[model samples]
Target: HMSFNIFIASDHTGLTLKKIISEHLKTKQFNVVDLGPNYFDANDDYPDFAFLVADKVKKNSDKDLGILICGTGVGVCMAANKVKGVLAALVVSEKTAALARQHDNANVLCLSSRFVTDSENIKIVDDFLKANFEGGRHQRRIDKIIRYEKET
Candidate 1:
């Protein structure tokens, strides 16, 4: 619903789900950029595709957000967080997706293709994208997250 560019990528483990989500996003008229694995094979590295998406988000921080898919989602989240300016969240449910943005200002949604089906992840993405940061006390906490990253 909000008009913003979305960037996505995934390894072979996530290709099918990535296409499903990509089509959904496009149908909703969200601008989407897909960084690809070029091949769908279980042997492919998740970080390769994840980092591509993260790189785009970091490079276009002012204009874009990201999504990544992997077997468990956690690996992509970890990979995306390594990029500067990316607040990636591994969301297992709608509540977590909403909070990822509302409280943490997450710029990326990491999806577990093996566990999250198309409809479920669609709702998660919709809720995550529609939610906005409730900056009051939450802003302070988000600032701490940024500060901790910097210090580390």
Candidate 2:
């Protein structure tokens, strides 16, 4: 949580929120990488950024996590999950954020720019970063996901 790298990205609608959160993360001293729509483009697609972050997380699955934002959070969540080994979850609150990590070991957290307040999303990210996988049965389940990834 304290030492892992956070890879984040967003489409046009979420870009402002992404910049806000990215700066917040940096101030907290977390290692963060912004995989972006570095500028503003109304046509920028969420899946493009989602895949970018998810692929990076796939490479360093043990030590990295990703944050993806879009209009509703659903688009990036769906796209990120398409990448093998990336467990992505859409969360609206700090409690959901912690649960996703603790129960599902979700490496990608998806947020909605239009739906969640910036301040709330920041707190959600903080809660997400603070949580540890309570990996007793959860480990067994994630292992099953790994098995499926290998078999498919």
**Residues 1-152 of candidate 1: C-alpha lDDT, one tens digit per residue:** 35567989988887777888888889988898778865667688888888888888887665589999988899999999998888899998876889998888898899988888878888998999888888899889878877887888
Off by over 4 Å in 1: 1-3
The 10-residue segment of model 1 with minimum total lDDT is 33-42
Top model by lDDT, which number?
2
Per-model TM-score versus the true fold: 0.91, 0.95
Q: Pick the candidate with the highest TM-score.
A: 2
Give the TM-score (vs. native) of candidate 1.
Answer: 0.91
**How far out, in Å, is residue 130 in model 2?**
0.3
What's the lDDT of the predicted structure labeled candidate 1? 0.85
User: Candidate 2: lDDT of 140?
Assistant: 100
**Model 2: per-residue Cα lDDT at residue 5:** 89
Candidate 2 displacement at residue 37 in angstroms: 0.6
* Stretch of 10 with least lDDT, candidate 2: 1-10
Pairs of residues at least 3 apart in sequence or in different chains that clash in candidate 1? none
